[PDB]
Amino acid sequence: MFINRWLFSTNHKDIGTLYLLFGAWAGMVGTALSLLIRAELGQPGTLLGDDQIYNVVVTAHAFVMIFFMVMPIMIGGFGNWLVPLMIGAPDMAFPRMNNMSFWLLPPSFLLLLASSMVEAGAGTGWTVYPPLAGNLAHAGASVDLTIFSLHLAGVSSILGAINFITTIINMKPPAMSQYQTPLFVWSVMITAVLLLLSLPVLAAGITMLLTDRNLNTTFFDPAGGGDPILYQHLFWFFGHPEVYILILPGFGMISHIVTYYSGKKEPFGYMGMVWAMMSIGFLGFIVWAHHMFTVGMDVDTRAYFTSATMIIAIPTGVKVFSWLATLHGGNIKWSPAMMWALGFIFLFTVGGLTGIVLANSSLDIVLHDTYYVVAHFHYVLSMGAVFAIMGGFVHWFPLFSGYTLNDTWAKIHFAIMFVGVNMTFFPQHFLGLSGMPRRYSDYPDAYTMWNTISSMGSFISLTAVMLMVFIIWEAFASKREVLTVDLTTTNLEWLNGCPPPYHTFEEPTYVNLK
Template sequence: MFLNSRWLTSTNHKDIGSLYFWFSIFVAFIAFSYSFIIRLSLMWPYSFLIDGNIYNSFVSLHAIFMIFFFVMPFSIGGLGNWLIPLYIGAVDMALPRVNNLSFWLLFAAFILGFFSSVFAMGIHTGWTIYPPLSSYIGSPNISTDFIIFSLHCAGASSILASINFFITVFFLTSDEEVLNFLKYPLFIIGQLVVAILLILTLPVLAAAITMLLFDRNFNSCFFSNWDGGDVVLFQHLFWFFGHPEVYVLIIPAFIMISHCSCYVLNIHVPFSNYSMAFAIVSIGILGSIVWAHHMYTSGMDLDVRFYYAAATLCIAIPTGIKIYSWIASFFSRDYIYIPLVFWIYGFLFLFTVGGLTGVLISNSSLNLFFHDSYYVVAHFHYVLSLGAVFGIFMSFFFLFDKFYSFYYDYSSQFIFFFLIFVASNLTFFPLHYLGLWGLPRRYLIFDFNFYEYSFIALIGMIMFLLSFVILFFSFSLNSKVVDSCFNYNDLALKYFIFKRNNFFHSYNYSIFYLKD
């Protein structure tokens, strides 16, 4: 029976991690199809979609699916479930049944989010669901309610998974490692910071969207200025979650860069390992106190804007430490130019470009011009769509042959990397110019002078599609089972990944700490 099947009721961390992986890859293609339709619609006036509400619905679902159902499940649910027990030498996660529940809550959230596109032309509020556009007057259809319930389920899933990760690390490791933070590998430190950020900020998002749900359906007025509420309050509550969420998405890419660098350079830890650990923690702390730089145009006082601009610039310090530490690691050793090296180089370039544009728009005066323009779209796509997703591709090529015993030959990996790298810059770099010329985002029709660069971005999207087709056929034709034995000099993982690589567990014994 299906109810007794391995995948539905499994409490094995590898099975659940695999469910996260394949679910996130499936959703990624759906979200990519939305983005492809968006770019087709912007090629020329009415070239594909002819209704602005449907266009905004595709924009909203693209963002929500990419963030909550692709990047987070892959980099947190998938990598975290697979690697945390292996790193600390535990048999499984501390709360295996909660682990199973967290995945199926995420699946239910995806179903609710998908249903929102079926009713009344979908949700056209943007992924931020700002009132009054998301109020009952602005969005009287049921699609917005489906998205709110979807975010509730996804948030509950992330909170449960984060609590599980936190308890696993602190209760299933030896006492001396728990007491010495710097003994943890960077992967564990990064996942702990991500878990803490989610536990602290997701309840705030849940409160905001619950109040919005009451405003829509039970005649309350939390976010109605006309009735004594405060519409800007929602923005504060949303971005108190939304900006730490940015670092929730990018920190797993940071730690995978560090461990992949160790593999390429055949070293135990990257250059300045302690500084890297403190930089991750500093990024998590500073990222939680700068949320209002998304709201410079909402009427804040000058001194408040000055604080948020200065605090945002401070994040560049730990981020710069990480960038220069990775560069120093590669300058300090000789290495072979395997495809993994190019993924690391590509990440460093794209993330640095995105970070530099972020420094520019963090200025509270310049931001008054750039706010809600295509310059902001280019910035966060360089940091997230390219930074975080390049980290995911790196994890895919680096770890999936160890997890599932298949691999892509080097020629396929090189071709895929160069296509993706060129496509990324063709798609998103022209958006900087559109933003500098003042083109606002979320518009289906605009001046004819802007369509030249929009067409260049479409060429980049076609190259994205071509690269995925090549990736699929190169796997179908050239994949082969490889020997599960490789030279991996990184901290801790080499001791566990093959010695305890059983897909099936027996729970006739207690979960306890294993140490060689």
């Protein structure tokens, strides 16, 4: 029974639980790697005395946090648990293929571990640019193991995208149109379209890197007529859609959380929220070369990418202001999930605005490959994704488990994390403006003060992460069973109780057309 249920699953809730467990474990690995980064940088000089290892830590930090923590938690975990329940469906469209999307991830993670254990690791950056990632500057198996790790993660998510799009289009009640489905469902559908179209291009690019390394192709090698810059285009043609993939399910959860703890039956401006997510998804495919403003690009191309990138602020602003308009007039419940969501709105806004700074290619000449970029994306991506994940986790933990958290401990946890991430990353703006490069194991002495503060910040967030584990333990240790949940008339996922039965919606909902 154990193996049948947990290794052979065809159940969207159990597979979502597997994903949440996997993503939480990956988050520990990713956090430890982040502490090693900040320990190396916490005083001038060298700590590891081996900068190839430093580079390996940085590279693996990003891959773990992106591919093994955020995507599995948001899409595999919250998506599988919530999307079928939010549309009254009995499972996902392809319940057995769904299980393979899950089980491809432990092997993918194993390949990434293998990459760091063999030879001297893949010390490439998560961008894996050639020729540094090629077979002369990174001879041996490490980079190929990384490529294969990405292949398996990519297949996992492409098949998951197929599953979610099909489920969301095909398995709603017959009366429910797409404009009657909750925003989180929209956010997953749009994320899945982005995954479907972007990951195959990454797969193509990394396959070309694999063949340059092992079959004597020369896609990226000038000696054969190739071009390192072609790899960068293929990589970022995926990689900008990827950063929107990382935040869109977060936007969807934030919409639900803000609505719920405002005491509202609906988010403000629903069709504007749908429009904004679709517009962000579409524009996310036409801006990638703002990751390449210093590669030697013609001025008119820089002008186009500057302008197209800035336009994304308009739909994003509609979402931010509509969240504020959802709070407006609310019966505000100051729950820990609400705190996470309010922290999200503010810190996402800060990071989005430094992204608008960077979109200006003239300024990006001086900010590119500095800590100003690191600060931008740890606000908008690292805090954005983590705060929405924590908000969603605190909000829906009683649904998934049947048990309540201790709200006081959860609020303490939020407070510690909010101090920690701001102490860590806010000073990195100054480091970037003043010229400190990213991907450095050590820095000119002038930069000591802010690196010291940033590293002390990283330890505060470590204390928060430890406390999170204790808080989950205390909830399962005490076994406070949920009784009643308010607002079920506008939060269908709660209406089958906590936790819902293994099979839900065996008899589908009744929705008429009128």
